[PDB]
Design a protein around this ligand. Structure first.
Ligand code: HEM
Length: 150
């Protein structure tokens, strides 16, 4: 599994600022994920077997979208400060523990990354190779803690 490599401060800023451009698009982020990975939608109790076009703009869909984004928001808020590293790692570890119980794989997390990258490329103004590199570094570090729990 990946090895943690401390992020540069500028890369942390690139993640926080590009995130801020999409974090109020929770429903669209979830829709993009399930559109790109229908097999992931099949794992969800509220969504399996339902038509994705029907699910958008319903409360159960916004509810799950908000839950995911709540955790991402917190994790990204905890980045950049040494005294917050234990708290950040505990958020990440708990998500790994919780998802282990749901049969979610390392590749599934990478699929979520792939879809988010495409969404950031579509919606974050000024997205470029540096933005991509910064998120790659953030995901590497997330995986270093999450993958061993899966
Ligand atoms: C950064 C990525 C992700 C985050 C932040 C996240 C977060 C969450 C949260 C907050 C919940 C709600 C229950 C709880 O609070 O523990 C949840 C449930 C769930 N997640 Fe994720 N998740 C992520 C990625 C994934 C991936 C890649 C999959 C695989 C397809 C997945 C599948 C599920 C399933 C099946 C549930 C349970 C739904 C249910 O009980 O009906 N998650 N996740």
């Amino acid at each position: 599994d990946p090895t943690w490599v401390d992020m540069e401060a500028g890369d942390i800023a690139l993640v926080k600022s590009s995130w801020a451009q999409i974090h109020d698009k929770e429903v669209d982020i979830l829709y993009n994920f399930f559109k790109s990975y229908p097999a992931s939608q099949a794992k969800f109790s509220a969504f399996a077997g339902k038509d994705l076009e029907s699910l958008k703009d319903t409360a159960p869909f916004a509810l799950h979208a908000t839950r995911i984004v709540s955790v991402i928001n917190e994790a990204i808020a905890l980045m950049g400060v040494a005294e917050n590293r234990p708290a950040l790692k505990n958020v990440l570890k708990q998500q790994g523990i919780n998802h282990k119980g749901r049969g979610v794989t390392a590749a599934h997390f990478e699929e979520f990354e792939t879809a988010l990258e495409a969404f950031l490329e579509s919606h974050a103004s000024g997205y470029n190779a540096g933005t991509k590199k910064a998120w790659d570094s953030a995901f590497n570090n997330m995986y270093s803690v999450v993958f061993p729990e899966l």
